Amino acid sequence: GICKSSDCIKSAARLIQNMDATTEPCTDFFKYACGGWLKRNVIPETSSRYGNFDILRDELEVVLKDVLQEPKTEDIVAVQKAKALYRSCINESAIDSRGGEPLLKLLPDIYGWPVATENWEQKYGASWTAEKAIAQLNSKYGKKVLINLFVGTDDKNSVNHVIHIDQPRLGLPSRDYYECTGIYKEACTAYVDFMISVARLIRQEERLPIDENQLALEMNKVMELEKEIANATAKPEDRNDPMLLYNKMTLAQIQNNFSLEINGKPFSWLNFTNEIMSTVNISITNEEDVVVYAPEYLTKLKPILTKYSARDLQNLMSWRFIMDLVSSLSRTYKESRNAFRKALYGTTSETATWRRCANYVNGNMENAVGRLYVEAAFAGESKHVVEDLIAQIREVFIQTLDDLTWMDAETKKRAEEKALAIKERIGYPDDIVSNDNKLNNEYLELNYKEDEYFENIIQNLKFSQSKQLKKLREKVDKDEWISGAAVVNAFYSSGRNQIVFPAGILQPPFFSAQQSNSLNYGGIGMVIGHEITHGFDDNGRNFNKDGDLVDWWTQQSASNFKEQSQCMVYQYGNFSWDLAGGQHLNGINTLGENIADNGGLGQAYRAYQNYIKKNGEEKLLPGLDLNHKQLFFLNFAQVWCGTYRPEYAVNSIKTDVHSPGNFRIIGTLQNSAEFSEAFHCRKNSYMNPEKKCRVW
């Protein structure tokens, strides 16, 4: 009584080859489920982490290579542009023959780079202002420095767009790096070395005298400046509550309550915002409503920038943009980034060019490329089976509301309302395949030259930013997908109350219409519950059924939610990551994701129980001394088989809101009595602690 189909056999082979049965499931289920895989594999030199997700993504890149590399006589314009963009990206010979000349032509348009200019104060400083300088990088090239001003959705009115003002990203992975001691020292050194390397190459190409001490001087003041900005930014721990983060006020209020003296001139928030919004012929007045997400950061920023000069600021300003462009120039400029890349990611080589390019074209033309990917690699049968699964999971979540003892009736009724209102996106939007006109018009304003790769990417920055700035006065399009189809992930949008499962993730081990149900539920089923539970975690719970930031919790049910979720904070916060140097995981910044991982797996299991009840046991897999309840957990754990480079473990433990894959498995299964039941785990074994956390 065993399944012997071709599809059952591949499932079993993959499961057996990846697992390590000589480990005890109740001592360490990560090694039991993934020991086989870890011993067989080594992280590629071009990868910072490697595992099931990464392999499936590199596989997806191959499909994109196949469909992008050969032009076809039947291609529509939208497709012709993507292939032309791919071909310009992979030429490399054409790119190298241009040296840095594409960058030199661009620097005059961002008020130059003082370290690589001569008499910068007389050329630009005369007609230079913080308002104009920051605005030019924001509105034309989408680079947000010092002050990140962007157009987004209104958290308290998900139909409109509003102007947000938030603290900017930093050159290094996180503010923690700017200690520049111990584990962050090498990264800080490579970063400033990276500055000087680029500054030297530009001056060399401009035939300018090179004063090595003057280079070190200016570029180290840039680091002492970004150190200050970095220390002024808010922690992620202090940005977890969207209610407290949402501070709406007019531009007049901002001028009163958040002034800035920069290079003597008083900063004008009305001149800064109009310098940006004029890029699309839009006028702004002092009565404009603005949402400030980092007011604390703006106040600490006032006495930082009074100290520095227009030159000192612009040296950091342009460096943040040049930082990203050297990779798109000749190999002399590409190489200047090596020591910095290795410090942050551990990688000794750069990803294959065709792999980089396929990803770039997919990231900028995601509907045109999604069309090519689904036509070549996606079934269509799959779309309807997943709808069925999302229906089963959504109901298990509602069903489970009644069993929850820490919520009162009125909060449960409103929790059920939001759940029923969740909008689902499966596979791909049908009109990217059927409506050729709509797709061509998405890219009509774009025109790519094949020998001019650098000019193409600049076009895409301006197009990407111009289209976002134009959204200020228009309503949120509801039909829009939050992700392309050629993506191996899934997403939830609190502003839209929308879960999405692109075609890229609807393949094994996650899902297949031909693999055992125990695997589907433990795979895509757990992912579906995970995305659903995002609408109810420490952040998504603040949004109602329409994407509006509004309290719908009773004082008691809110207080209890915090109480229940504090267990998971301490659990994961007590995990030490050997790869990150024994550092502890940040249980606060990972809470939302561990809630989703724990609720999601719970919802999937109860959906597989409900299925067995209505349908019964399916046949077991060959070569596995495991029943289907144990197969459920095995496949769920094998979704996360992976490992990190030490350099990137240090990076991700600060910047990744997810737990590392190994601790997602252990933390989640430690809180699951059903796992311990399935694997008959002793009490207080490592995988079955008597104290177990639970929110959803």
Ligand SMILES: CS(=O)(=O)N[C@@H](CCCCN)C(=O)NC[C@H](CC1(C(=O)N[C@@H](Cc2ccc(O)cc2)C(=O)O)CCCC1)C(=O)O
């Ligand atoms: C506003 S937003 O929509 O953009 N919010 C993001 C927040 C995180 C961004 C990361 N892109 C979001 O929802 N992201 C999708 C992500 C999907 C899941 C996930 O874990 N995916 C991992 C995949 C991975 C990759 C490499 C590796 O070695 C190990 C694992 C990941 O991406 O790291 C898929 C299974 C459950 C969640 C989620 O739901 O959080």
Ligand SMILES: *[C@@H]1O[C@H](CO)[C@@H](O)[C@H](O)[C@H]1NC(C)=O
């Ligand atoms: C790369 O660009 C050069 C210069 O424009 C051109 O001669 C060459 O044919 C291109 N390569 C390919 C494969 O088309």
Ligand SMILES: *[C@@H]1O[C@H](CO)[C@@H](O)[C@H](O)[C@H]1NC(C)=O
């Ligand atoms: C970092 O910011 C805090 C808050 O303003 C301040 O008290 C502290 O002195 C700053 N640290 C440095 C090194 O400037």
Ligand SMILES: *[C@@H]1O[C@H](CO)[C@@H](O)[C@H](O)[C@H]1NC(C)=O
């Ligand atoms: C902003 O001020 C500058 C003078 O510093 C001026 O040239 C520019 O036109 C102003 N921009 C707007 C949009 O008012």
Ligand SMILES: *[C@@H]1O[C@H](CO)[C@@H](O)[C@H](O)[C@H]1NC(C)=O
């Ligand atoms: C570890 O767990 C204990 C017990 O709840 C808790 O007091 C402590 O804060 C946790 N450690 C971390 C780093 O979260």
Ligand SMILES: [Zn+2]
């Ligand atoms: Zn998540």
